[PDB]
Amino acid sequence: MVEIDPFEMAVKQLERAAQYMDISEEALEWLKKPMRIVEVSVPIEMDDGSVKVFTGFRVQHNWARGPTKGGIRWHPAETLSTVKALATWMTWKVAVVDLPYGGGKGGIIVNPKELSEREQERLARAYIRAVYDVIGPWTDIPAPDVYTNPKIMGWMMDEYETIMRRKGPAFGVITGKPLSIGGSLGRGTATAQGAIFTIREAAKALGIDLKGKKIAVQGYGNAGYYTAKLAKEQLGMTVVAVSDSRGGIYNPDGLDPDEVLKWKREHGSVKDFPGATNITNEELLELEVDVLAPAAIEEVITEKNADNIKAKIVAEVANGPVTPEADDILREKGILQIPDFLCNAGGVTVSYFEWVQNINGYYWTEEEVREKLDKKMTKAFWEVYNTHKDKNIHMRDAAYVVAVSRVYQAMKDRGWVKK
């Protein structure tokens, strides 16, 4: 009786979102099954002169709004219950920011750290020849995800362009491509710039000036390094705490965000920086910071460290680091938290800006992408925040009300659901 399923906990979050709105019963049973699941066998030729067969999936959840978009995972812990869960999760993310997109995902049961560079080409190309019949520039647009990179997304475009015989906008079949093949600028800081705008706009919602406040970021990856970098160089945050998987430091005067990265490449981690106080990962949470933004791993702020957090804005960069048990603990403290698919919607929004350039054929510049990402994320916050201020419901549950109704209005106008 101990069962934690990924797809079952993806449906229970929808039936929690059915109570706070008026939705017909015949459309509620439509959204609990993806409309097309393709599971194929992917054969490659190894370097030993032998043939293996990997099991590769593809799940398209709902194309009511438009074409579907989702990443490609390469992990040995993949199942069909995991890919169908993130596919239903993807439709609510690409709805709340007002995109013409539906949900999708794909995965191969493989372990990429035991394949050579020649074998990764034969695996990525043979994935396209199996599921070419269910993708395309107007049908399904893959994207990079865990254990993929823009190098591999260049190969899947080349194998698609050979099959298509170049009769169509073949650069739009996959996003997150390299720079000199038809990719977009402003992809490398897409999750960081897109999250920095919502923290800037949430300053106005409480009426707070950010010229000289404090911020802390857990983790120091590429989505972690650029978040604390933009805080000083744009806003004025006295960055007083950073950390990684190894350790954490502190400064009561501030931290230059690029000065730390030069130490971390020479050393192994952020441990023992000169003029710092080596503390643990746990004490970074309970510090006196104005705005906290975790990005390290899921489930970091739990039911015992729930009431220790003293802040004003908790920005969720990583995917849901706040448990539903801790969801209602912070609200009675008076803490404004942003939802998990609203603060890191900068990944899909710039990846939509790559898909717009590839279809038109006219590439933008870096001055143009930062402007239209600013108008999207500011609008997508004030639509969510005005919903929470009216029905007096929590910000996490209010985000589904806008995401479901934007899809259900598209299902009703296409005639799929009469009632």
Side-chain angles (χ1 to χ4, degrees), residues 1-21 23-419:
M1 291 299 189
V2 184
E3 288 165 334
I4 311 178
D5 185 84
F7 182 63
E8 188 179 3
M9 275 186 171
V11 176
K12 249 52 190 169
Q13 290 162 343
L14 177 56
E15 290 190 23
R16 188 145 185 87
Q19 310 167 6
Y20 297 119
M21 49 179 307
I23 188 174
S24 52
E25 188 61 38
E26 69 188 25
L28 234 198
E29 307 288 336
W30 191 291
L31 291 166
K32 296 182 184 179
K33 44 174 60 60
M35 299 176 66
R36 183 203 274 121
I37 303 178
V38 193
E39 169 175 341
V40 297
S41 164
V42 185
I44 76 173
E45 172 189 354
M46 227 77 177
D47 283 326
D48 327 340
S50 67
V51 183
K52 285 185 66 64
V53 270
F54 302 110
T55 309
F57 316 104
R58 186 77 213 183
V59 173
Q60 301 181 359
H61 183 267
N62 201 249
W63 52 79
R65 298 272 308 180
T68 72
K69 149 156 278 187
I72 291 183
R73 298 174 47 94
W74 285 9
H75 204 237
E78 288 287 87
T79 12
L80 199 54
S81 293
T82 309
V83 177
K84 282 161 61 176
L86 309 177
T88 312
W89 187 269
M90 203 75 186
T91 316
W92 324 136
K93 172 153 51 252
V94 307
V96 85
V97 216
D98 190 74
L99 306 185
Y101 271 158
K105 214 66 172 174
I108 300 176
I109 310 183
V110 83
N111 185 20
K113 287 176 82 272
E114 280 207 324
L115 300 188
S116 58
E117 271 286 335
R118 285 153 50 90
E119 286 157 328
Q120 281 171 91
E121 181 168 353
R122 296 163 177 167
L123 178 58
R125 289 172 177 274
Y127 179 71
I128 285 298
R129 313 171 65 178
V131 295
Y132 157 74
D133 302 315
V134 297
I135 64 170
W138 288 99
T139 311
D140 201 2
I141 314 160
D145 209 351
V146 207
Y147 289 83
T148 20
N149 37 90
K151 178 183 192 171
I152 304 173
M153 309 270 93
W155 299 341
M156 298 187 182
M157 207 276 312
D158 173 59
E159 196 61 42
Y160 182 83
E161 198 198 48
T162 309
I163 285 180
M164 207 190 188
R165 310 309 306 166
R166 308 157 34 160
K167 297 191 183 305
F171 288 166
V173 81
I174 178 171
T175 63
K177 283 189 298 297
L179 233 186
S180 64
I181 204 176
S184 164
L185 287 98
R187 189 201 70 254
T189 63
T191 322
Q193 189 82 50
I196 234 293
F197 283 161
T198 29
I199 308 169
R200 187 191 60 191
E201 289 301 317
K204 192 178 177 179
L206 292 100
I208 261 71
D209 204 325
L210 296 180
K211 187 190 176 181
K213 297 295 172 49
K214 329 289 201 319
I215 194 175
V217 170
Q218 191 172 350
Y220 229 59
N222 187 61
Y225 162 68
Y226 271 116
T227 303
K229 176 174 182 54
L230 293 182
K232 176 193 172 182
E233 300 179 17
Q234 170 155 191
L235 246 38
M237 293 295 184
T238 309
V239 182
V240 293
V242 290
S243 63
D244 70 323
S245 56
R246 210 81 137 270
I249 59 171
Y250 176 78
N251 199 303
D253 193 278
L255 286 181
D256 297 313
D258 303 333
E259 238 79 15
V260 193
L261 206 65
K262 186 105 275 180
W263 179 270
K264 195 179 164 296
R265 303 314 293 265
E266 191 66 40
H267 252 40
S269 294
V270 213
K271 192 152 52 184
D272 316 325
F273 186 80
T277 308
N278 172 264
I279 66 174
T280 69
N281 236 262
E282 201 90 357
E283 300 148 310
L284 178 128
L285 307 179
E286 34 99 335
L287 244 178
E288 187 186 5
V289 281
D290 179 79
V291 36
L292 214 157
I297 34 172
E298 321 180 14
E299 303 183 21
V300 286
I301 304 178
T302 57
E303 65 186 300
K304 336 168 202 307
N305 40 329
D307 241 80
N308 308 136
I309 309 299
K310 313 182 188 60
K312 294 194 189 60
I313 290 166
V314 180
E316 297 184 322
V317 173
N319 309 276
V322 175
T323 74
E325 256 61 46
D327 220 11
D328 303 352
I329 299 179
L330 303 184
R331 192 185 177 179
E332 58 93 11
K333 305 190 64 62
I335 304 173
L336 170 62
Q337 61 178 72
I338 4 183
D340 31 1
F341 41 82
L342 191 58
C343 189
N344 55 92
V348 201
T349 321
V350 184
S351 171
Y352 171 63
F353 287 163
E354 180 187 351
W355 179 78
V356 167
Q357 293 163 89
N358 291 346
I359 296 297
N360 304 144
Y362 178 45
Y363 294 143
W364 299 339
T365 45
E366 248 270 18
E367 200 178 312
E368 279 166 325
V369 182
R370 186 181 298 176
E371 235 205 43
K372 298 165 185 183
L373 187 62
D374 197 289
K375 287 201 172 188
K376 280 285 187 183
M377 295 296 302
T378 303
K379 183 210 171 180
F381 175 73
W382 284 112
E383 187 183 13
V384 166
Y385 184 69
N386 280 148
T387 289
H388 134 81
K389 282 291 292 298
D390 287 338
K391 299 174 181 175
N392 206 9
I393 69 186
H394 194 269
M395 282 277 302
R396 179 61 136 269
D397 298 327
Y400 288 107
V401 186
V402 193
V404 165
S405 294
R406 266 208 172 90
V407 177
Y408 167 67
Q409 198 68 35
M411 271 171 55
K412 189 194 303 177
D413 282 327
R414 278 160 159 269
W416 285 349
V417 269
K418 287 95 179 56
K419 296 169 55 56

